[PDB]
Amino acid sequence: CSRLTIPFPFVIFANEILAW
């Protein structure tokens, strides 16, 4: 999941919770 989120042929195209 830390790779690119786009398929192979298209690689060339590219404090409120601490209170909880």
Added chain:
Amino acid sequence: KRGKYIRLSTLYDLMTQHWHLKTPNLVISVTGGAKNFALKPRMRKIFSRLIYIAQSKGAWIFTGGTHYGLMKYIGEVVRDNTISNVVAIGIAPLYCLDNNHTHLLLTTEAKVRTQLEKYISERVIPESNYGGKIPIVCFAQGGGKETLKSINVAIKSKIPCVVVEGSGRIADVIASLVEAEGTLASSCVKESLLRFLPRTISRLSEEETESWIKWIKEVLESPHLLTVIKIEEAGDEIVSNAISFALYKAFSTNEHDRDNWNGQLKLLLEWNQLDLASDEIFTNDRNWESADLQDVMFTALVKDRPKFVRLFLENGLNLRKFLTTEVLRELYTNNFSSLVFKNLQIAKNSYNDALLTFVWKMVEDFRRGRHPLQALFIWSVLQNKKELSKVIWEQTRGCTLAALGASKLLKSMAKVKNDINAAGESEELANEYETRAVELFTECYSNDEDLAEQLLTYSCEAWGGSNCLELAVEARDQQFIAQPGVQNFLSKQWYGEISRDTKNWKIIMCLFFFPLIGCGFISFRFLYYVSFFTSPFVVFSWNVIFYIAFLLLFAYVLLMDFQKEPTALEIILYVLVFVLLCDEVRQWYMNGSKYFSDLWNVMDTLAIFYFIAGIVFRLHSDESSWYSGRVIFCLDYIVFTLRLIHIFTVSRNLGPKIIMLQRMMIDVFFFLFLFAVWMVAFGVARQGILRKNEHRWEWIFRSVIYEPYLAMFFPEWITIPLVCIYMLSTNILLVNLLVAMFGYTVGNNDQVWKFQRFFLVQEYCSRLTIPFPFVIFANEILAWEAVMKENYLVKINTKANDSSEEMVHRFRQLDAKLSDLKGLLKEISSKIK
């Protein structure tokens, strides 16, 4: 952001009409501006359960809205509950204001606070739970003059009950001056209050210190308005055990509700006061007819009081009469949570079974418009009512069946990944309905086996449309099926009307010699042949014996026969293959296009369709396709023998090894698939390197697949990385081989194969009970387990022995005995004076 403030020196309408809602409860916390307040782990817990109670009942919490000690802790628990409604109204060298109260109304302030809360106690309410009257409670935990007159002006002026506890300065005083009758104890206020808070008396005059004795002694003029949260109450639900007992005291001592037993019940039902409602209401000196216990029952179901549903049933309430046609539809759309019903949509669509379709349609026809007890049970199972559904289960008629249908309905609603908290709870509740149906059925099987096995196959009167066995295989309830009652049932369904005590070989030798059945050789249970040859152990033994003789005759046809004409041997080879196909088409039902997904049952059909093509090539009369009809018979002879090898493989390892096998079968099929992928890529590499560079046809695409198997059955610098291919292709294929070996291990093991041994034998018993050559020729027990359930519920209830050895009754039964000795010591001193 919010927080409203009003400067102040008639009031109530400016906050219930302009601002917010009505009060079913109202709590008063009085400490005053104590800048210090020792919050223990206990006092942090008492005033955190209290705001959860005000969150549940919807109360107002009047306190002094300044940012010190308790009142800044009460404020910061309120914003903790609005993070995870509560209306904490605040009324107040110099104190700073508290930035956590919802509405602020700022010594000089404790008269408008009293005359407000004395007005809310004055009101008359048409909802009328507490006789109307809006329940007012006043807490107390600390010392000082201000919290002493707050208890005074509560109790003396009107009747709000007051709750204190034994941790503090003067709330410990009144916690000590209530277990004592000394004719108002005219100077024990001085004999208390000095030895437990010695520094406050030497700070003021005597005439006001005696006024504190006048203050305290008029609190104790009514001890029915004074509940004490004692220190030894080391458990949850002790604030509400004190608030409800304070509200029950003030309600029942009105001297008006002697005829109103029902108003005491609805009060004691809203709070979960079971052990108070049993001994103060249902004691048979009070007169109730068990006819007005029905609207109180419908409230005990919807607010999830499971202990009160049980108390209403055991005091006399016919649940069959109560569950009318409209109560179930005031329950499936009015009191059905939409998060479950949205989750019922996803379970019905993504993991669809025959039981869910009856459940999804019976939820719908109540929300759109007869076994009523089993509709209330599904209502309380779908919503994961953990302990209410255990009460309705004991009132159902088919109790082993409904414990399995609930265990399947939850196991399908726990297959939804929409919320893994609700899917983790309902899987846990399903695992204790399967356990509930194991130990009920072993109780039924420790009685006579002919009635418990009458109950396994009960026609259910359309519960879900299935018996207890069908509802346990589809649920994959491995614990219900691995129990010895169900395994003994199947081994009698497989041995048939033959007894299991005859021998194993004694059955087989009666196949080869029919007149041994008519003697006393076999000990089954006038024409015993139709009983012997219908048991599926004999049908399986004859079908394998026929299948070997079919293969020994197909070997004679292939070698000695088969010259040019299909003579009398080969025609009956069709007829023996035809009954191997006629039974397949009559078993081609119930497939769902998934019966053929195992490579040993699609192999059965593809061995005949590759054999029927051998009868096509047989009747062509030319030598160019007669021999092509022999090589398709000889290749099909190996397919028919591998099915015999697979029959011997399964039927020997049908036991503990049936999990190791058939997991290793799909693990070797994956290795052989990866080996076939590698042999294809070895074929392209070997064809691309060798000759015939551009001289090709569809010769290539049919040879490259087979040239490495014919290979199985210039060195400048590339020869050394050719070995690094054989050190990589050996590695990645040997790992797939060893994964196939040891993959059965990784992944209670007795109930895994006992479910599979049950599922395979019941799959074979669901075939025809006639051998291969003859396929062309073709509420009295629910009353019994109601007795068996009550014997079972006695077993699990009297298993509270390690909780009876917890001596919390014996820690307090001598406290009444030592106080029996205590009071007699005191009165004998009064006589000799």
Added chain:
Amino acid sequence: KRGKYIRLSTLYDLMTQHWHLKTPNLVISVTGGAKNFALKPRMRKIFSRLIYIAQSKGAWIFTGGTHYGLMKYIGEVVRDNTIS
């Protein structure tokens, strides 16, 4: 199916000679027509062990034969022991 009834305002021979057997034990449960009866888990157990004892010793259990509270519970444990 069964269940015999006699309207009544010397008696014993008309049930040991015409009807059934002799008594090694004889239990008397007296509550009267209490229309309400709080059956706890304990009182459900005391009056279920008792009928098992009368099953073992072969007793007669005289009670008020009306369908209310204990006497309808005593009756329905009796048919539970004739089922098991």
Added chain:
Amino acid sequence: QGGGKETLKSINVAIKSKIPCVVVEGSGRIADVIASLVEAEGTLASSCVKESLLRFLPRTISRLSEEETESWIKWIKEVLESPHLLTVIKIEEAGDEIVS
């Protein structure tokens, strides 16, 4: 096991007339009374029937006359004339085989 006038004279006409033994237990209205008036010798306890029976069932006394309420004291005290015909299934007997 329960209360009322009828189960009180049933214990009476059992014990007084002939000798069948009587078994009570401590869960009920007046069977809890005689479960409390057997661990006590007070020379027949001439008014402890009033010192019992009121603090543990307070609504049945204010439904009838006094001369029959004193007759209930006459009813209860002739039960206790023979305490060898009065077994109590006590509450702490949390186990099987306590009826027999």
